[PDB]
Amino acid sequence: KQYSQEELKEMALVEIAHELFEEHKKPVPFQELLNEIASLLGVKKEELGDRIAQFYTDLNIDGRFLALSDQTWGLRSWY
Amino acid sequence: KQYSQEELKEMALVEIAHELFEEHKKPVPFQELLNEIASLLGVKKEELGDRIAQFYTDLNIDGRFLALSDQTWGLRSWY
Ligand code: NI
Ligand code: NI
């Protein structure tokens, strides 16, 4: 889009998420948003470690976003 | 508690939910919140219907409330 990776590195994770939602047009679970945001920032999501809580808080405080109910499922064999 | 049912009848659901949380101090699933609110208003869960959606949007927009990622568990028997 309209942001270089340098600009994105300057942004609040919530504003990157807002940009992602605006192009996805669908609900996205938190771990997938972290993966997508990590990839735009040139990192792996575990490297964000420090900014996860600010991010989560902001999603909660900003009324642009809703926490939706849906269940994530996976395979037992993966863990 | 400091509210009569007559006072509760003139509050937004979200304001009742805030008092319940302050009263009980633990996380609640949304349906249980509804269950407890409907009981305090002496109505049946169904009777609210139209206000539920506005209730879930207030919870999202009001910055005092966090949507928690914790998993709700229950018994298959109950359904
Ligand atoms: Ni929110
Ligand atoms: Ni909120």
Residues whose CB falls within 8 Å of the CB of residue A60, separated by 6 or more in sequence, listed in order: A67, B63, B65, B66, B67
Q: In this structure, what token pair is assigned to residue A79?
A: 């863990």
In three-state secondary structure terms, A30 is: helix
Rounded-to-integer distance, Cα B7 and Cα B45, Å = 19
- Assign residue B72 the CATH number of its domain: 1.10.10.1250
Rounded-to-integer distance, Cα A10 and Cα A19, Å = 14
Q: Which residues of A touch B32 (CB under 8 A)?
A: none
Q: For residue B41, give the nearest of B15, B72, B61, B64 by alpha carbon.
A: B15
Contact (CB<8Å) B63/A65:
no
| Overall residue count recorded for chain B in this entry | 79
In three-state secondary structure terms, A76 is: helix
Number of folded domains that form chain B: 1
Q: Is B75 on the interface with A (CB under 8 A)?
A: no
**Burial profile A28-50: b = 16 or more Cβ within 10 angstroms, e = fewer:** eeeeebbebbbebbeeebeebee
Q: How far is CA B75 from CA A26, A74, B33, in A?
A: 31, 20, 18
Q: Is B66 on the interface with A (CB under 8 A)?
A: yes
Rounded-to-integer distance, Cα B2 and Cα A70, Å = 36
B17 by Cβ neighbours in 10 Å (0-12 / 13-18 / 19+) ranks as buried
Given in angstroms, what resolution was this structure solved at? 2.0
Minimal-distance CA residue of chain A relative to B62: A61
Which member of B30, B60, B66 has the closest CB to residue A63? B60
Host domain of residue A17: 1-79
